[PDB]
């Protein structure tokens, strides 16, 4: 857990136990080509390598074999109108490499093409934003700019 004091361990004491795990986790699609067994997570800063092995095998029951962490530096090069730097936060990235020869491929969340077509009636409103865009009545150049409302 995070933002708590840890109880101190003297030689020969009880086991440290977390009961309600404070910190989240999120697995990300890797931006570079990676092996078939390596799953990439986004770890909160105060969470060790061995705390992720016990997290995943304990909560999700996956065979973690090797964990490798690194700290990503968010850029402090972007400014307000006040010319003050805006720090994108640092985040710990961890590369969980699965055991028993297993293999993970990141799924296609958001399939790009849903059924077949573009758009009609998602929820009145978008009817006039289409049925006058096919009823446009583009200006005939033979008319030369005269308004076409009058039946004369």
């Amino acid at each position: 857990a995070r933002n708590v004091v840890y109880p101190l361990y003297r030689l020969g004491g009880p086991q440290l136990r977390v009961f309600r795990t404070n910190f989240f986790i999120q697995l990300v699609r890797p931006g570079v080509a990676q092996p078939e067994d390596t799953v990439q997570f986004r770890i909160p800063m105060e969470m060790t390598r061995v705390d992720l092995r016990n997290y995943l095998e304990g909560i999700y029951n996956v065979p973690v074999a090797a964990v490798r962490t690194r700290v990503q530096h968010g850029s402090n090069k972007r400014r307000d109108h006040r010319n003050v730097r805006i720090k994108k936060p640092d985040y710990k990235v961890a590369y969980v490499q699965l055991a028993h020869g297993q293999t993970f491929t990141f799924p296609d969340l958001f399939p790009e093409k849903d059924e077949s077509p573009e758009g009609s009636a998602a929820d009145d409103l978008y009817s006039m934003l289409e049925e006058e865009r096919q009823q446009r009545q583009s200006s005939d150049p033979r008319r030369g700019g005269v308004p076409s409302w009058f039946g004369l």
Binding site: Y6, P7, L16, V18, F19, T48, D51, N54, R85
Partner: protein, 117 residues
């Protein structure tokens, strides 16, 4: 010459970038030859229950009724947990009612917090 940026572990020379780490908690110690001995008991072990057959889902249905906020005060927790066990032994020491003065022999001490979360 920079002043306003947060002094993180990425910033100093080699002897500076080792000593300061991020907010991770220590696990063991270093001995001679810079060899790290990991202590097993300092590693927090996730007490995870079994969720099989559990019937509480992460959202509550909108058909559920609403109520009034009563934060659990010390008087309410006394009146439910203790006060009937007082009355059954009053119509017939306080350490028989869960009251423990000293917590030196106790594992989950309440003051100061010996547990985590």
């Amino acid at each position: 010459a920079d002043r306003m940026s947060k002094w993180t572990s990425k910033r100093g020379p080699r002897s500076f970038r080792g000593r300061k780490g991020r907010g991770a908690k220590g696990i063991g110690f270093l001995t001679s030859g810079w060899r790290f001995v990991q202590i097993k008991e300092m590693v927090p072990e996730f007490v995870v229950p079994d969720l099989t057959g559990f019937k509480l889902k992460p959202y509550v249905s909108y058909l559920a009724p609403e109520s009034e906020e009563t934060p659990l005060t010390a008087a309410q927790l006394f009146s439910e947990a203790v006060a009937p066990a007082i009355e059954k032994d009053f119509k017939d020491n306080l350490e028989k009612y869960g009251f423990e003065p000293t917590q030196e022999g106790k594992l989950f001490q309440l003051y100061p917090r010996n547990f985590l979360r």
